Design a protein around this ligand. Structure first.
Ligand SMILES: CO[C@H]1O[C@H](CO)[C@@H](O)[C@H](O)[C@@H]1S[C@H]1O[C@H](CO)[C@@H](O)[C@H](O)[C@@H]1O
Ligand SMILES: [Ca+2]
Length: 451
């Protein structure tokens, strides 16, 4: 049976979805305040990202309507440049999870068509893929000012391409992404398992040396070391080794404690200089640590997971709206009148990002401590109070520190329905539901089977 908090998640989903249906059907993103839409892919991004969430939440009439759109209206031949990583985690991942949950081969046929159109990105001298590929013309290229790719982008596509090869029997997808993983396994320039942010597609070597973050441009590299190891049945020992090494590197170089509360946080390093800056993106890490412990990683990882979960919770609850900003800074020394969680004026936006509630899901699944459910519910209520648009939809907001004037940005990111609400529903579940023994979630919350 659905419980009270799950019913609340479903009310939020359906209010979001009614805005999408009325004002943005088949378009990439809802602009709820203006009752319009935006495109970047032109491939119904929000719809595809939400397929599996609709299925899991039991929204089967909505799923059927969306399936009909996929069957009739989703076509990949347009002259359009797409980012390989964003494409892969949202569209390829979303189609693959929709296939597995529904059993409907339409989703696999579409995934295979799309996957084939992404392949030109790998045709570089080093076989590290370009950032962008045109799905209609077959031309791939790097950004205008550089031949570098982003490290997280080239190392956070593996689950999806590996699974596509498994289902289709076409080895080209797996072979391409595994070359990337194996190459990066042997690269110089890491700091105790920590990777630089960029990698050159011509030389194959890291660039921006000596600069280390667990946030944007590197985060999901670490996530996918563990998750690939799990996906593959725990036989690919190099992935585990590199993951274990990296977590020790985080402990050695990036962990400090805040004032006044002594919260454990992860900062950044540049040429040996520590910076107390932490992207909300880093909040994936407690959940990934806990996931690893479920699968046999050391208890030290759980100690760190629980400390970081508290911190990520505080990043939300110390704000006036109860919603974390995009980026926080912490103080290493006591500052009269100051909270733990400092926020630069420019960083005060919230884009409805999932990483805190993602990690709460894993902490709850692994520990059973109901406080993590309570924290998730608190955060959901804050989304409802400060980001809801009366006519339908929820919006990113510009100011998490002004409860009277949060200032909507007029955008509902696809990951709100793809991730934030899926993880909350799962967090609250009393159930055999997407077992950690049977599935691994991709980095856009799309569950894929463990082999
Ligand atoms: C700017 O940050 C984004 O892109 C870089 C890659 O250039 C990633 O390293 C970073 O994690 C995010 S994408 C990340 O977050 C989104 C939700 O907040 C969502 O698309 C997905 O979870 C993805 O992993
Ligand atoms: Ca993610």
């Amino acid at each position: 049976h659905l419980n009270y908090r799950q019913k609340g998640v479903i009310d939020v989903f359906l209010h979001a979805w009614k805005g999408y249906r009325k004002f943005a059907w088949g378009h990439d993103e809802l602009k709820p305040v203006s009752r319009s839409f935006s495109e970047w892919f032109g491939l119904g991004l929000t719809l595809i990202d939400a397929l599996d969430t609709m299925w899991i939440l039991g929204l089967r009439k909505e799923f059927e309507e969306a399936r009909k759109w996929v069957s009739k209206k989703l076509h990949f031949e347009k002259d359009v440049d797409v980012n390989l990583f964003e494409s892969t985690i949202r569209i390829l991942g979303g189609l693959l999870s929709a296939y597995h949950l529904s059993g409907d081969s339409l989703f696999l046929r579409k995934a295979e068509d799309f996957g084939n159109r992404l392949m030109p990105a790998f045709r570089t001298p080093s076989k590290i893929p370009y950032s962008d590929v045109n799905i209609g013309t077959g031309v791939a290229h790097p950004p205008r000012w550089t031949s570098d790719s982003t490290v997280a982008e080239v190392t956070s596509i593996q689950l999806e391409f590996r699974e596509l090869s498994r289902l289709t029997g076409d080895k080209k997808f797996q072979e391409a992404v595994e070359k990337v993983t194996q190459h990066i396994h042997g690269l110089s320039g890491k700091k105790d398992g920590l990777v630089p942010m960029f990698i050159n597609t011509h030389s194959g070597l890291f660039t921006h040396l000596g600069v280390f973050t667990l946030g944007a441009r590197a985060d999901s590299y670490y996530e996918y070391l563990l998750k690939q190891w799990i996906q593959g049945g725990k036989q690919e020992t190099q992935l585990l080794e590199d993951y274990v090494e990296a977590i020790e590197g985080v402990r050695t170089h990036l962990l400090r404690h805040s004032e006044p509360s002594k919260l454990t946080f992860v900062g950044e390093l540049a040429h040996g200089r520590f910076s107390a800056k932490m992207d909300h993106l880093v909040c994936f890490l407690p959940g990934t640590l806990a996931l690893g412990v479920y699968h046999g990683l050391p208890a030290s990882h759980m100690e760190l997971a629980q400390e970081l979960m508290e911190t990520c919770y505080q990043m939300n609850r110390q704000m006036e709206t109860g919603l974390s900003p995009e980026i926080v800074h912490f103080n290493l020394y006591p500052q009269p009148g100051r909270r733990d969680v400092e926020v630069k004026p420019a960083d005060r936006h919230n884009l409805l990002r999932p990483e805190t509630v993602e990690s709460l899901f894993y902490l709850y699944r692994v520990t059973g401590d109901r406080k993590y459910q309570d924290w998730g519910w608190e955060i959901l209520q804050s989304f409802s109070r400060f980001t809801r648009v009366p006519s339908g939809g929820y919006s990113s907001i510009n100011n998490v520190q002004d409860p009277q004037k949060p200032e909507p940005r007029d955008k509902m990111e696809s990951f709100f329905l793809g991730e934030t609400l899926k993880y909350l529903f799962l967090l609250f579940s009393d159930d055999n539901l997407l077992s950690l023994d049977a599935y691994v979630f991709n980095t856009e919350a799309h569950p894929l089977p463990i082999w």
